[PDB]
């Protein structure tokens, strides 16, 4: 599970920094949660958890629920946050974040 890939302490702090609606900053969240300490293969393992339905893509529903993929206590993303995150991650413009797109988003954080 996520707390086997990332530390629960780091997840707690990361989620806790973004409790207010509209606060989410993907670069800062990825830093805080420990994604900037992970190998390329472990970044992909995190993706696969976030891809809740195992389609190979983080669709809009899974994107709005992204924080819940890290902690089930978390809020849904706000509308502003989902729009800016999708735009940041969806480089090919198809409305979803795929494997490489997620890896790139993390690498650049
Ligand atoms: Ca999916
Ligand atoms: Ca895409």
Q: What is the CA radius of gyration of the chain?
A: 12
Q: Are 73 and 15 in contact (CB under 8 A)?
A: yes
How far apart are the C-alpha atoms of 15 and 55, rounded to whole Å?
25
2 contacts 49 by C-beta, under 8 angstroms: yes
Binding-site annotation: residue ranges:
51, 53, 55, 57, 59, 62, 90, 92, 94, 96, 101
CA of 95 from ligand 2 middle (Å) equals 6
Q: What is the DSSP string of 25-38?
A: -HHHHHHHHTGGGS
Q: How many residues does the chain have?
A: 109
Residue 89 neighbours by CB under 8 Å, 6+ apart: 26, 58, 97, 101, 102, 104, 105
Question: Which DSSP state fits 58?
Answer: E
| Consecutive H or E run containing 66 | helix 66-70
Biggest CA–CA distance in the chain, Å, is 35
Q: Is 81 helix (H, G, I), strand (E, B) or coil?
A: helix
Residues 6+ apart with CB under 8 A from 41: none
User: 99: CA distance to ligand 2 center in Å?
Assistant: 9
* Residue ranges covered by each domain of the chain: 1-109
Top-level class of domain 1-109: mainly alpha
Distance 8 CA to ligand 1 centre (A): 24
């Amino acid at each position: 599970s996520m707390t086997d890939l990332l530390s629960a302490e780091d997840i707690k702090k990361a989620i806790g920094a973004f409790t207010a609606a509209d606060s989410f900053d993907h670069k800062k969240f990825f830093q805080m949660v420990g994604l900037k300490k992970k190998s390329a293969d472990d970044v992909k393992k995190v993706f696969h958890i976030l891809d809740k339905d195992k389609s190979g893509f983080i669709e809009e529903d899974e994107l709005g629920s992204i924080l819940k993929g890290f902690s089930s206590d978390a809020r849904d993303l706000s509308a502003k946050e989902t729009k800016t995150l999708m735009a940041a991650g969806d480089k090919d413009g198809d409305g979803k974040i795929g494997v490489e797109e997620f890896s790139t988003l993390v690498a650049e954080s």
